[PDB]
Amino acid sequence: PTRFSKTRKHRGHVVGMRHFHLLRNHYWRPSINIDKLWSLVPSDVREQYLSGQKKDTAPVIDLLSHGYAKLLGKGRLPEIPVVVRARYVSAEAERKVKEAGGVVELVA
Amino acid sequence: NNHFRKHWQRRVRCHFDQPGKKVTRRLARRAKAAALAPRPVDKLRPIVRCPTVKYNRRTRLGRGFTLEELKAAGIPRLLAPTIGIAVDHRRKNLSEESLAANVQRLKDYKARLILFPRKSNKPKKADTPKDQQTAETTTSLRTSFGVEQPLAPGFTEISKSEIPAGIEGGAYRALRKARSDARLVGVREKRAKEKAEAEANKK
RNA sequence: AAACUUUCAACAACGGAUCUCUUGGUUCUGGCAUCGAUGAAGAACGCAGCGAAAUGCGAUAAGUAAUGUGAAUUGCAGAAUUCCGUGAAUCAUCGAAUCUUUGAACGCACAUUGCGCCCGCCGGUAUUCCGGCGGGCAUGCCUGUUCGAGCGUCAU
RNA sequence: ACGAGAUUCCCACUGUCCCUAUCUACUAUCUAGCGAAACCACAGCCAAGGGAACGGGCUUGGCAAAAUCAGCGGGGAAAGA
RNA sequence: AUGGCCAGAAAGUGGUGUUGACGCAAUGUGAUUUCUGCCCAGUGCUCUGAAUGUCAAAGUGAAGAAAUUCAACCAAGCGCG
RNA sequence: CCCACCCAUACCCCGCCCUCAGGGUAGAAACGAUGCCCUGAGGAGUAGGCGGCCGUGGAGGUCAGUGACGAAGCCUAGGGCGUGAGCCCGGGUCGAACGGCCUCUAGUGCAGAUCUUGGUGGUAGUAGCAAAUACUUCAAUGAGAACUUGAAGGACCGAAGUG
RNA sequence: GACUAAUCGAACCAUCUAGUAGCUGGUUACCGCCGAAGUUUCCCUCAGGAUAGCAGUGUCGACCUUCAGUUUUAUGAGGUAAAGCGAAUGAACUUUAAAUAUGUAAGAAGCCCUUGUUACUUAACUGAACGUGGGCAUUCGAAUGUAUCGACACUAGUGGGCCAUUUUUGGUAAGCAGAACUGGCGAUGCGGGAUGAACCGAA
RNA sequence: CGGGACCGAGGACCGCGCUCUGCAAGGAUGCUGGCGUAAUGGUCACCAGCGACCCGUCUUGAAACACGGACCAAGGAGUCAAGGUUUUGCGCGAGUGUUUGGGUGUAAAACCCGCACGCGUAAUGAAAGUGAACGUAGGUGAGAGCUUCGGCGCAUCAUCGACCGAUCCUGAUGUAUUCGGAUGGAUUUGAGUAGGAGCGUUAAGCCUUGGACCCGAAAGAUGGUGAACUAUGCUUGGAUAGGGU
RNA sequence: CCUAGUAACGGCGAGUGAAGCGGCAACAGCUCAAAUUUGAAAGCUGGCUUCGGCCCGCGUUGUAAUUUGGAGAGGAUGCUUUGGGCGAGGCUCCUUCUGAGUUCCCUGGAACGGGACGCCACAGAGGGUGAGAGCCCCGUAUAGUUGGAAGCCAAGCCUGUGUAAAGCUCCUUCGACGAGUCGAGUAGUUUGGGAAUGCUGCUCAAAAUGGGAGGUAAAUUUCUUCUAAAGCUAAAUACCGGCCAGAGACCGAUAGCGCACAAGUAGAGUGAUCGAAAGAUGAAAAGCACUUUGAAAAGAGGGUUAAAUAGCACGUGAAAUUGUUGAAAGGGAAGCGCUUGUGACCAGACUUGCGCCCGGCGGAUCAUCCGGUGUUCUCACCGGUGCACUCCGCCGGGCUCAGGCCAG
């Protein structure tokens, strides 16, 4: 607003390579760490798994349906087996998943 | 980064007519619906998968059904656009899954279709009889025949006994091996010719 | 002391500020597609009982016909209107008309109200002369008709 | 030869002076009528001092009496400066 | 004169030109009288006289699988005389 | 060398204003707590920085707002409030609208720009109104006659003319 | 370089066009709270730049540690005055020691002791560096003062000006010209020097 | 022990005290007179004593010079948009943003809807690519607050460590025997991780680009209009006593 | 909208800058050339018509049917499809018509103002009428309701049926597909495509699973996508021109368009062009009869008006500047600050309040008790009770206190 300006108060006193035809869809691959992996599970079902009422069932999580292509390995996982379907995975992420007792499957 | 070094004030576009244009579009849609009653306002569209690896996880509506899809569904290509089915001749079916899904879509539409006779005093064999001509109808094929499951289900429960063993050696090592083989496909085949030629020479 | 100059006040001047107004601008939004050789846009010259302009109109000239409304117009003059009506009006609508000289402007020209040609009709004694009136006479191109030209190709 | 080209001198001639004087007409003047413009911070007497070499206003003195008319060209104004 | 000097965006375009060396065009000097300090050869003016020395494009040859590279030949002018 | 005296916005004491700082204020008889009470210190200012308030045109809400028994505007050697910008009232004039409070909004505040438009002064009843030889008498007309007319006189253009 | 409609070393008209200027002129109410600045250091200078410094608003941090254009003490520079040479020796002699201002240091965040390593050094486990553990709170180890803290953020002007005292370096016939500190002024009223940028008193 | 001047802030009590029926002790009362209106007070005009340059603007250090100002009324100059950055307020929060669009409407308002998308949630490398826990998300010294009084220790700072990507060196088990790159090192690097802080919006300050606070230049360019003046030329007209040689 | 100020281009850097995907608005598809109808040019312009047709011609150097790459042609095969004519009803555009006070009083020149009593409202938008009007007038809201024309949509219903055309399924075979064009070099220009862009000119100049593209030059071997050099087509999109309409936190006559007015007018310029100033009496002209003085303009009386302090110089009527009247000052400037004084002119303040003691009046909304009601649940109000030594007003006296200005 004009009435709040200082001017009303001051009235009276004055490298590397080139890539031709770059397509970002080639390099689209969003990543998620393992400490946010359980957040993809719905909240009630996730709370049942974390409490331990499901001792004979293993959740299958599709990262491509949630919008992620790569599973990264920052954080730690609980001792619950999880099936992870991902296009890419890091070595530490797969190691931590196998320590938790699951398996990382590769999809396209 | 201000691109104001041209004569920008001569082609500034404002949008004060946005609600008026919405009103005009709604009036045009109502007029189109009244002219097209009792047919739906839009045509039936197939379900297709988006190109590129960024968007190949999602399906959407395409332009029109393929000729092979119409032939498998039993609808002739000259009848199809006259009963509200969009037809595309450029698109082909490279796999059986999309073809079967669109054939099932066409069969559901044909089962729910009511075909009035051209002459009311002389109904035909392919024409819907008058005692089944009355029902509750729809006027939005984009709503009644939308993409029900655009993305794959992101969560699935399986028993702990049926957990797969996975790829031997690890998924990371499998990806690295695949990349290495893709990079070394040519050199190994070249040394394959070299070994074959050496064996033929010194057999 | 007065006059004069200056200061203050009241009233009167000069001038057109202020306030209020607003048949006007400015901006936005919605709707529509319709100029012209069947002569446009523009220009000129005229037209009212009494007008110079604006407005409207074209020698049928502030206008004609037709439809509707239904008693005016108004500055003066003068007439109304069988008011129980083919009907006032500077009224409205508008499908029928009129539409001067020009202008893409079209017989040739135009710094001229200049000069022609073709075909009819009428009047003056008029087969010959004179006058008036009416209808026409641009260019490029298309389709067709008709009249032609050329050892260009042939038949005979 | 010719030249509204530049220069020096001689004779004649004279108000250029020496040395100024006088006359006429039209103004200027006064009246009747009519009637602008330039310019204008405010104003107009001087002397000495007012560090920046400038005073019109300040300081200290001289002084200093209404309202005016014709002239004048020292300042101050005034040169499409 | 299939020319010179000009002009035009171009033109089946225009002028000089209804012209032809006692002519046309461009310069310099500027009536008449006087008048060419003496001699060259550095700059310049012009000689198709021999050279390929410089040597563009097009064209020619070689290498390679080709892109490409390397060679000669190389107009005028310049260079030499 | 000595005594007395003069006075600066300097120093001392007191009052009042503002700013800053330090305290108090609820089993609320309790307060524009964004208030009030108590105590101390300080006060120049260009460039520059910051805060609060005043005013103008318009908008939402509100004041059960003002008004032909007189709105707005204007004039006033008439008064009141505020440090101030300003606000309010009296009197005269006048004729149709206008204001207070909280928010919103801006084409929002002038002494200058050899500004811009319009209006008006001093100069000032002043400079001038002096080229082209020149006017005069009687009568008439008329409210009024140097510059209208008729007559009577005097002159000028001077035939490359004032034809 | 004359004329081409009062316009000519390139006419007039409209438009691009509200062309550009670093140069000139102007830039609109009040009160309150703060409040400045002229080689510090780097860059090739003029037709040059940044930058230090000095300021205001906000905040936040335990606004915690206290620090200080000052004196004293210890020790430097100035040993220079001075006293004596019945002390030695002879400003250059010394037992002792000037005035003016001036450098460094004056604690628990400190002082040592001990143990090792050293890639430092030393003839050297020797000094010292780095760690380790311990002793020192019995006074926290001069004076005076202390609404004086610290760190960010954002914003602004000025950053090779004038005058004066002192010190120092050069000079001129005489004038003077550089630096270093400090004070005043540009930004400032009051009292007195009759008067006034640079004087005195006092803000 | 006298003589004089100026001042009277506060507004029940409380306190320190004393000379203690009370008081000069945390700020003036008591008595009396005149008048009760222009008498006090105020405004305007004028005289008197003292005091007092004409305003901007510009310049440098400052004056002087210079430039503008005859007078009055009305306009009249840091605005708007886009994109940044810091701070204030607000909503939600590992998310956030309805308004391109759709629905709806009492119709440019308001209300409702969601896919995609933007920014954030991961970085580093020229790229291929790879990708953030040894530990109660570490040790030491501080540190508000709390404490069962032994300590626990927010934010933040210093310091030593740990992890991820880039660079260089070695090259393990294995093997398309030449692929793969484990492990151990060493330098810097990155607003990297190490118990998310962002997204939208409001207000203010500053840039950055646009005419960009307002008024101006000699200019440059595009397209048009003029030989009624004047210059030259062409066609067709007109005009110029009397003497001397 | 997003991609995205990104890929990319750029002296000495100022700067420039797309596209694919994704979401949405809107959706719509087709026509030729290249074939022999060859058992019949089946096609068409024009002229004359008795409206049956008949002629003059165009055209075989190709007018109809058929085919257009999604295919198609030929076969096989067995099923389906079709032409006309009414049409209820609906929509669009002009047309007739629509609710309620001029009730009473006051001010006023005039109520449309104030007060009272009503009424209408799917209408309290706007305007006019002598001042702010829902009900005075035009309109405004809503359903409809009169009359008329031209179109479009359309539920249904009558009839002909297969000479002909058309669709579906399968297939040995066939399956024509655009040339100075594509492409290459070079030049200019352009682009983010200054290695990957497009356009044009000159030169060269194609091919038949061929050709183009696949954003780094080239060769070889593959692969993926379309099918150029012929053509048509609504919608979503733009809109400082035109026509009709509705609006605004815009401007309110130096503003807003140059123009609210006989404005692109008057006027200037040879011309191209340039280009203003200027709105408001009053509700109604009721715009001053008549008398008188003047040559006249006008003046003065006297009317008109609610007002002439509104006189076609016209609403309001500032300032600069001027005239008169009144007051004052003035020995080569005025103007301003502090403080008196004089003259002129003013605003306040004050006029008495409160509390007692007597006397005289007028009344019982004194205290207690009972009932009802409300509340803060113990405080109140209301109705009966007071019978005048108790409460409340009024008037005469007296006393105390507080009251204005200047002073001792």
TrEMBL record, chain B:
GO terms, biological process: translation
Name of the protein this chain belongs to: 60S ribosomal protein L13
Protein family membership: Belongs to the eukaryotic ribosomal protein eL13 family.
Compositional bias annotation for Polar residues: 131-143
Alphabetized PROSITE patterns for the sequence: RIBOSOMAL_L13E
GO molecular function: RNA binding; structural constituent of ribosome
Tagged with keyword Endoplasmic reticulum: no
Organism of origin: Chaetomium thermophilum (strain DSM 1495 / CBS 144.50 / IMI 039719) (Thermochaetoides thermophila)
PANTHER family per record: 60S RIBOSOMAL PROTEIN L13 (PTHR11722), LARGE RIBOSOMAL SUBUNIT PROTEIN EL13 (PTHR11722:SF0)
Matches recorded under Gene3D superfamilies: 1.20.5.110
Keywords: Ribonucleoprotein, Ribosomal protein
Domain of life (superkingdom): Eukaryota
GO cellular component: cytosolic large ribosomal subunit
